[PDB]
RNA sequence: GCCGACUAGGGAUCGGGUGGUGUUUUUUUA
């Protein structure tokens, strides 16, 4: 499940990424 | 309808339509009781009719299914059999005015003929290139099977002697079978 | 290039009739297909036919009695007039009184016969004979 | 709980009062099923004759509660049939027309399930509508199909034939 | 309570014979079955009779 | 087509209803008008000619349908008139229509014949001449012919045929032969399996019992009708069936063994599962209670009593409980001193059963029925048992007490009635 | 039926006729909804989410079980994809094929598959633009 | 010869999933009882994941090409 | 015939009975 | 080698899946 999980798929996920990016 | 015929010269007209029967549904088959004037019509529902009554005298029906063909018995004239579109054969008795027995086949039967010499025995024209010979009392099994056609048999008839049967098929052939033998002795 | 569902059904029915098969399964189904089928059936060219709903487009199975010579969907959708109808029949049917041209008009899908009797016109769909 | 509380309709009919009384009696008898029965409430009832001569109780219900009813519909229906013999107890929700008709049919066939639906197009032009039903509880619904056609025709004004494949009824 | 138990409570045997209607097999009629289940049996019963008739032709 | 014929039949009915409210319906002119409808109701050339049509004309004859359609209207109009206007219902006014009635009776169409039967039933009481009277006799013969040809009695024509036979025997002095009566009753017996469409047949069966015509199969009818009451769901069929059997039971001769077996059914049918079935039995038992011989009542009193207290005590339907209490209440005055003495032992016996609480409620509830039917002080010993039983109940009302809430409530109920009876 | 290939495979899933939840299923509809959110918060796409629910929780289907598509369920709870499942996977595959290609400058087969992948992207990108799920200014890489 | 409208039940069972009169799933679901804690879990017949007991974190099944092979010792029922 | 070499339970079907799918009344 | 929108098949074989069966195989290391 963990190996199958992706860090970057959901609008919330990139929102987290967008949050940490800035 | 009435037809003028030259069978006898004991007289000398009124030839044409005599009486008409309106039905709510289409009619697909008709047969007449031999002993009495009563006759049956097979369409969406199997109906018993009298010549002198314009409406269907009695309504027979096992279920909602339509009836494709029928044939009265020639010896036990009170018994009737019918064919349905759900690959079924239904038996009836006029003495009880109700259906008697039903069996479902792998395919539809297009025609049914009763043996003139065997009151309890009849043959059925089936759509699997086969004709099936049946005893009325025990319908769990067939008496005999005929296999020599290559298209669905459309009509079947007993010899009035009762010892041969003739079958008609979509394959452009007519076959004659001996009653105790399962293969045609002849093809036309 | 894929063909319309009507055309596919028509071709299947024609093929099976010509190979002598007595039952045909048509998929998918439609109101145009089904309506055209009872038009045939009223004209007796086909027998019992039955509809499977699969919760999808659906399926038909048609009994054939071998009286169908040829059936087809005509294209393109060109309009047809009432008083003029006859000539298209003469063009689109083998003979004068043989066959039925199917037409979809304001009053539904119907042969040209019930059409001229109702004095209605509309779009032609095809032919059966 | 009074029978009227179970009846959403402001003016309860007499038969509504009897059925609500039976429902609250089941609540009181039940040690814990009451917990599910108490929230559950029905809009109305309608009793219809059948060809066999018996009657059928079509309970008109709200859909979001109809879910909960369906969770406990088996036991509740059996109990009410005990209270009201000669009567078939059925829960139908009140609700495009094709959608609602099929939903009513699904409510009818509950607990059993519809294997299929057939339509036969006859030579004369007669239409035979049929519904193919699973054999999960074949014996019980084999005592009830006449009620099913009566209900469907009475409510939807349609002729329909329920059959059960895999068996020659 | 059942009917029988009350009539036993009297314990008299002359009161018991007075109410003769109560002693005997229950003749309460059974609840009717569905029509098709009835006619299915009727069809079965008819099929028996028809079989007996045609068997006369057997000889 | 048939669908349009059905539509035409409706309009003709709508027209007929309008006449009923038409002022012309009250005049004598209409009878002449209906009279009018009846009588009104009763090679080298082809070698030269180009032919462009391949279709042949189809033969059809709708003249007969017009004749029947007009014939049906006049019969319905005539029957509507004579029923509504009594003066027109006279031999002189209706003498001329008899030859049309007999012709309509032979018509192939059933509906017109049905209307022919309806009018003839209306004219049965009316006096007629020798020529105009044979039509009643001939129709009695015809309806049998209809019954003979018909497969099942459950037919709209046959049911009306039985209706005329009922009136024929009821009113006309001439009566059908027993063998013919035996045959027709044989045919209705299987068709009676579905009573819903045999309401008219019941009225014919009522005619037979009304005149007390002795016929073997009529005994089979009584057995069959008895089942129909407690089983058939329709309200009407139970009522019509209830009266005929009750008259049959009370009029026709029966062996003593049968009489008990007839009363075996009612007490056993009292335990029928369906509430309506038990209710249907109440009216019969009530009929036995209200009007019956004292010896017959005394013979069966003890059985009816304790059978009723059952459904009063334990029954899913409160009304069946209430009715049985009402039934017991109207009986206890009528029972003899000895028979009531047996009742006195019974109520005392359960009150004596202090050990069993179930026996207790019977004593108190039955004691309530005892009061207001026989009254208080008729049996002092039973009253003391109730008062003692009430005291022992009310004393043990504490939390430690084991007495159930139904018991203390039952004691209060009988106690309240005892206050109304007496000031002690 | 395959584009960019001669295969005519018909392998696929066949939905059951019944559109009511299984009689054997006895878990609350909502408890699924929070459970769906939990993996989707963990980072599993609607595709993988459905695989786990059915495999371990008896969820035959998301519509039949609760009446809503898992995306709509996720969309209702404030969660969704940026770009669709289908397009999202194509981009990474196009990425990976490219990330291969610089190191290995003789993979003439790989470059061909890139064109097949890229053209598929353009068609899929074109249509998602038309439905407006993808605003028009989007262009591939 | 075969009746297209009324095919034999066996013939349907023998034949492919999708080309049928009415296509439906041949797959199904199971109750599998955990050997460790005796708790019951719902597992798909063709499950694609190594379904694990939530209570025990114990493997109940392993993925395969078709049906997932239930782990040894895991008692199972059709649901 | 080939299947019969390994499977234990295959009832032999009388061809007079194969065409019958079912009967309402069982005797 | 007639061609096509075109039916039902036969044997063998490659890859995958389902079911059965009894020989290899094998044992709480995997």
Report the 3 state secondary structure along H20-63.
CCCCCCCCCEEEEECCCCCCEEEEECCCCCCCECCCCCCECEEC
Whether residue G118 is contained in a domain is answered as yes
Return the closest nucleotide (C1') to the Cα of H64. J17
Cβ separation F260–E21 shorter than 8 A: yes
In chain G, the number of structural domains is 2
SS3 assignment, position A10: strand
Say if residue G87 is in the same domain as residue G138: yes
Find out whether the peptide bond into C28 is cis, omega within 30 degrees of 0.
yes
- Exposed/middle/buried for residue G115 (C-beta within 10 Å: 0-12, 13-18, 19+): exposed
Q: Which residues of C touch D116 (CB under 8 A)?
A: 52-53
Q: How far is the CA of C60 from the C1' of J11 (A)?
A: 36
Nearest partner of E8 among C76, F346, C16, D147, judged by Cα: F346
Alpha carbon distance D126, D112 (integer Å): 29
* Claim to verify: residue G74 and residue G120 sit in the same structural domain: no
C22 contacts chain B (CB < 8 A): yes
Tokens (6 digits) for D143: 């005592």
Residues G106, G67, single domain; the answer is no
Rounded-to-integer distance, Cα F272 and Cα F286, Å: 17
**CATH number of the domain enclosing C112:** 3.30.1490.10
- Which residue of chain E comes nearest to B94, CA vs CA? E50
Residue D96 CA to residue G65 CA, distance in Å, equals 22
B112 touches B72 (CB < 8 A)? no
Q: How far is D111 from chain G (nearest CA, A)?
A: 8
Residue nearest to nucleotide J7 (CA to C1'): C19
CA B155 – CA D69 distance, rounded (Å): 56
Q: Answer yes or no: do G104 and G73 share one domain.
A: no
Residues G88 and G76 in one domain: no
Note whether H6 contacts B128, CB cutoff 8 Å: no
Judged by DSSP in three states, G87 sits in helix
Same domain, C11 and C39: yes
Same domain, G111 and G89: yes
Chains that touch I (3 or more CB pairs under 8 A): B, D, E
User: Is the same domain home to G55 and G88?
Assistant: no
Can you give the CATH number for the domain in which C47 is found?
3.30.1370.30
Strand partners, C73: C126
User: Is residue C74 domain-shared with residue C55, that is, in the same domain?
Assistant: no
Check whether residue C35 and residue C83 sit in a common domain. Answer: no
Q: Which two tokens stand for residue C74?
A: 């005509």
Resolution limit, Å: 4.7
The domain boundary, picked from G59, G80, G101, lies at: G80
Calpha distance H10→I20 (Å, rounded):
15
Could you give all domains of chain H from N- to C-terminal order, each with its CATH number?
A: 1-79 (2.20.25.100)
E52 touches B: beta carbon within 8 Å: no
User: Which residues face C101 on adjacent strands?
Assistant: C127
Q: Which domain holds residue C57?
A: 1-68
* Cα–Cα dist H32/H56, whole Å: 13
Q: Which residue of E has its CA nearest to B120?
A: E54
Q: Are residues C11 and C54 in the same domain?
A: yes
* Pair (G74, G108) in one structural domain: no
Q: Are residues C10 and C50 in the same domain?
A: yes
In a domain, G128, yes or no: yes
Residues of D in contact with C52 (CB under 8 A): 116, 118
Residue pair C58/C52 in contact (Cβ under 8 Å)? The answer is yes
Residue G1 lies inside a defined structural domain of this protein: no
Is residue G59 domain-shared with residue G110, that is, in the same domain?
no
Q: Could you tell me if residue G65 is inside a domain?
A: yes
Q: How far apart are CA C54 and CA D132, in angstroms?
A: 12
Domain edge (last residue) among C68, C84, C118 = C68
Q: Assess G43–A contact: CB distance below 8 Å, yes or no.
A: yes
- The coordinates were experimentally obtained by cryo-EM
Helical pair F2-21 and F63-84, crossing angle rounded to 10 deg: 30
- Residue G1, both tokens: 């039926």
CA angle E49, E51, E55 (to 5 degrees): 120
Residues C84, C63, single domain; the answer is no
* Total domains in the fold of chain C: 2
- 3-state secondary structure string, chain B? CECCCCCCCCCCCCCECCCCCCCCCCEEEEEECCCCCCEEEEECCEEEECCCCCCCCEEECCCCCCEEEEEECCCCCCEEEEEECCCEEEEEECCCCEEEEEEEECCCEEEEEECCCCCCEEEEEECCCCEEEEECCCCCCEEEEECCCCCCEEEEEECCCCCEEEEEECCCEEEEEECCCCCEEEEC
E35 and D143 within 8 Å at the Cβ level: the answer is no
Structure tokens at C115: 């059409």
Q: Do C64 and C83 fall into the same domain?
A: no
The first and second tokens of residue G127, run together, are 């249509």
Nearest to B103 among I15, I16, I23 (CB): I23
Domain holding G119, by residue range, is 81-141
CA B46, distance to chain mean position in Å, is 13
Same domain as C22, residue C57: yes
Q: Report residue F128 as tokens.
A: 């007629």
Listed residues C68, C89, C110: the one ending a domain: C68
Residue G53 sits in the same domain as residue G31: yes
| Cβ distance of D55 and F196 shorter than 8 Å | no
- Residues F203 and F218: their CA atoms lie apart, in Å, by 14
D161 contacts in chain B (CB < 8 Å)? 63-64
- Asked if F367 contacts F355 with a C-beta cutoff of 8 angstroms, the reply is no
Do C12 and C4 touch, CB atoms closer than 8 A? Answer: no
**Residues G109, G55 share a domain:** no
Residues C29/C50, Cβ–Cβ less than 8 Å: no
d(CA D64, CA B5): 77
Question: Looking at residue G122, which CATH number applies to its domain?
Answer: 1.10.287.10
Tell me whether strands H40-44 and H61-62 are parallel, antiparallel or unpaired: unpaired
Closest Cα in chain H to G19: H24
- Interface partners of chain B (CB pairs < 8 Å, 3 or more) are C, D, E, F, H, I
CA distance linking residue D137 with residue D143, whole number of Å = 10
Footprint of strand J on the protein (CB under 7 A): C 11, 15, 19, 21; H 64-67; I 6-8
Same domain, G96 and G135: yes
**What are the φ/ψ torsions at residue B129 (nearest 5 degrees)?**
65, 15
Question: CA of G72 to nearest chain D CA: how many angstroms apart?
Answer: 20
Q: How long is chain H?
A: 79
Residues C29 and C91 in one domain: no
CB atoms inside a 10 Å sphere around CB H29? 19
Residue where a domain terminates, one of C68, C90, C106 = C68
- Residues C59 and C108 both lie in one domain: no
């Amino acid at each position: 499940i963990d190996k199958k999980a992706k860090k970057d798929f959901y609008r919330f996920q990139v929102r987290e990424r967008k949050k940490q990016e800035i | 309808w009435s037809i003028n015929v030259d069978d006898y010269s004991n007289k000398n007209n009124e030839e044409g339509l005599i009486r008409t029967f309106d039905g709510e549904s289409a009619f697909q088959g008709i047969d007449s009781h031999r002993e009495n004037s009563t006759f049956a019509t097979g369409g969406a529902k199997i109906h018993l009719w009298d010549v002198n009554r314009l409406k269907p005298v009695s309504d027979l029906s096992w279920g909602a299914d339509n009836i494709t063909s029928l044939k009265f018995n020639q010896n036990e004239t009170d018994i009737l059999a019918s064919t349905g579109s759900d690959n079924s054969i239904v038996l009836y008795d006029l003495r009880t005015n109700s259906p008697t027995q039903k069996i479902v086949q792998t395919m539809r039967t297009n025609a049914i003929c009763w043996n003139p010499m065997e009151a309890f025995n009849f043959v059925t024209a089936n759509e699997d290139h086969n004709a099936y010979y049946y005893d009325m009392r025990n319908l769990s099994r067939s008496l005999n099977v005929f296999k020599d056609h290559v298209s669905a048999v459309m009509d079947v008839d007993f010899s009035p002697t009762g010892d041969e049967i003739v079958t008609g098929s979509y394959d452009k052939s007519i076959r004659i079978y001996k009653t105790n033998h399962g293969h045609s002795r002849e093809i036309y | 290039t894929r063909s319309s569902v009507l055309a596919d059904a028509l071709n299947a029915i024609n093929n099976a009739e010509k190979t002598g098969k007595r039952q045909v399964l048509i998929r998918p189904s439609s109101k145009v297909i089904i309506k055209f089928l009872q038009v045939m059936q009223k004209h007796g060219y086909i027998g019992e036919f039955e509809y499977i709903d699969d919760h999808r487009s659906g399926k038909i199975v048609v009994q054939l009695n071998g009286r169908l010579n040829k059936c087809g969907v005509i294209s393109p959708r060109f309009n047809v007039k009432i008083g003029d109808i006859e000539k298209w029949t003469a063009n689109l049917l083998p003979a004068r009184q043989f066959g039925y041209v199917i037409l979809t008009t304001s009053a539904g899908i119907m042969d040209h016969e019930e059409a001229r009797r109702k004095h209605v016109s509309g779009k032609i769909l095809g032919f059966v004979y | 709980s009074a029978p009227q509380a179970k009846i959403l309709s402001q003016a309860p009919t007499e038969l509504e009062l009897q059925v609500a009384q039976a429902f609250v009696e089941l609540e009181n008898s039940s040690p814990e099923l009451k917990a599910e029965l108490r929230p559950l409430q029905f809009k109305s009832i309608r009793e219809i004759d059948v060809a066999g001569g018996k009657k059928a109780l079509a309970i008109f219900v709200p859909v979001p509660s109809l879910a909960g009813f369906h969770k406990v519909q088996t036991k509740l229906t059996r109990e009410l049939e005990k209270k009201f013999q000669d009567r078939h107890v059925i829960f139908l929700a009140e609700r495009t027309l094709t959608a609602v008709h099929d939903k009513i049919l699904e409510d009818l066939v509950f607990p059993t399930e519809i294997v299929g639906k057939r339509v036969r197009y006859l030579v004369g032009g007669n239409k035979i509508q049929k519904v193919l039903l699973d054999s999960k509880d074949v014996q019980q619904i084999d005592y009830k199909l006449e009620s099913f056609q009566a209900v469907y025709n009475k409510l939807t004004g349609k002729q329909i034939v329920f059959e059960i494949p895999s068996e020659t009824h | 309570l059942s009917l029988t138990d009350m009539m036993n409570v009297i314990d008299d045997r002359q009161v018991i014979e007075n109410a003769n209607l109560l002693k005997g097999k229950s003749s309460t009629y059974e609840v009717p079955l569905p029509q098709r289940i009835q006619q299915r049996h009727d069809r079965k019963a008819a099929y028996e009779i028809s079989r007996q008739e045609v068997s006369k032709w057997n000889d | 087509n048939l669908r349009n014929q059905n539509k035409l039949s409706e309009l003709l009915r709508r027209y007929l209803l309008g006449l009923n409210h038409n002022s012309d319906s009250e005049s004598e002119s209409i009878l002449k008008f209906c009279h009018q409808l009846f009588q009104e109701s009763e090679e080298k050339e082809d070698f030269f000619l180009v032919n462009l049509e391949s279709k042949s004309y189809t033969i059809n004859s709708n003249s007969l349908l017009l004749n029947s359609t007009l014939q049906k209207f006049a019969l319905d109009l005539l029957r509507n008139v004579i029923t509504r206007h009594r003066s027109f219902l006279t031999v002189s006014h209706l003498e001329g229509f008899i030859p049309f009635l007999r012709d309509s009776l032979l018509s192939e169409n059933e509906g017109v014949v049905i209307s022919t039967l309806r009018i003839l039933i209306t004219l049965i009481r009316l006096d007629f001449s020798d020529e105009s009277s044979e039509i009643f006799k001939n129709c009695a013969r015809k309806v049998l012919n209809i019954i003979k040809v018909s497969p099942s009695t459950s037919s709209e024509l046959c049911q009306m045929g039985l209706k005329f036979l009922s009136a024929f025997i009821r009113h006309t002095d001439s009566t059908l032969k027993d063998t013919a009566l035996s045959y027709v009753l044989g045919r209705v017996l299987p068709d009676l399996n579905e009573p819903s469409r045999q309401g008219l047949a019941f009225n014919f069966l009522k005619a037979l019992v009304s005149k007390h015509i002795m016929l073997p199969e009529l005994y089979d009818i009584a057995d069959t009708t008895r089942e129909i009451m407690v089983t058939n769901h329709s309200k009407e069929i139970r009522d019509v069936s209830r009266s005929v059997y009750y008259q049959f039971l009370m009029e026709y001769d029966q062996s003593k063994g049968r009489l008990e077996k007839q009363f075996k059914f009612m007490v056993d049918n009292l335990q029928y599962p369906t509430e309506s079935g038990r209710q249907s039995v109440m009216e019969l038992i009530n009929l036995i209670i209200t009007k019956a011989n004292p010896a017959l009542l005394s013979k069966l009193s003890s059985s009816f009593f304790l059978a009723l207290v059952n459904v009063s005590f334990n029954d899913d339907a409160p009304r069946c409980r209430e009715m049985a209490s009402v039934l017991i209440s109207t009986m206890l005055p009528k029972l003899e001193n000895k028979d009531l003495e047996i009742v006195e032992k019974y109520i005392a016996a359960w009150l004596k059963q202090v050990d069993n609480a179930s026996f207790l409620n019977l004593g108190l509830r039955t004691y309530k029925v005892y009061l207001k039917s026989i009254g208080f002080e008729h049996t002092i010993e039973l009253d003391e048992l109730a008062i003692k039983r009430i005291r022992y109940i009310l004393s043990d009302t504490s939390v430690g007490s084991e007495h159930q809430w139904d018991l203390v409530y039952s004691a209060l109920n009988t106690f309240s009635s005892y206050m109304e009876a007496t000031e002690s | 039926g395959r584009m960019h290939s001669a295969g005519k495979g018909i392998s696929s899933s066949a939905i059951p006729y019944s559109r009511n939840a299984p009689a054997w299923f006895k878990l609350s509809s909502e408890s699924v909804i929070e459970q769906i959110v939990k993996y989707a918060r963990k980072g599993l796409t609607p595709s993988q989410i459905g695989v786990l629910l059915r495999d371990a929780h008896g969820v035959t289907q998301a519509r039949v079980i609760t009446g809503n598509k898992i995306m709509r369920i996720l969309k209702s709870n404030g969660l969704a994809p940026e770009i669709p499942e289908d397009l999202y996977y194509l981009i990474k595959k196009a990425v990976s094929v490219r990330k291969h290609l610089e190191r290995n400058r003789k993979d003439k087969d790989a470059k061909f598959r890139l064109i097949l992948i890229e053209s598929r992207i353009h068609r899929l990108a074109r249509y998602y633009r038309t439905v407006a799920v993808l605003p028009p200014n989007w262009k591939y890489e | 010869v075969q009746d297209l409208l009324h095919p034999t039940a066996a013939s349907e069972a023998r034949k492919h999933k999708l080309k049928t009169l009415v296509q439906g799933p041949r797959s199904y679901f199971l109750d599998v009882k955990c050997p460790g804690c005796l708790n019951i879990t719902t597992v798909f017949s063709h499950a694609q994941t190594a379904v694990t007991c939530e209570s025990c974190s114990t493997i109940l099944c392993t993925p395969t090409g078709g049906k997932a092979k239930l782990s040894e010792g895991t008692s199972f029922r059709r649901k | 015939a080939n299947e019969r070499r390994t499977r234990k339970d295959m009832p032999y079907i009388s061809e007079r009975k194969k065409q019958i799918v079912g009967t309402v009344h069982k005797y």
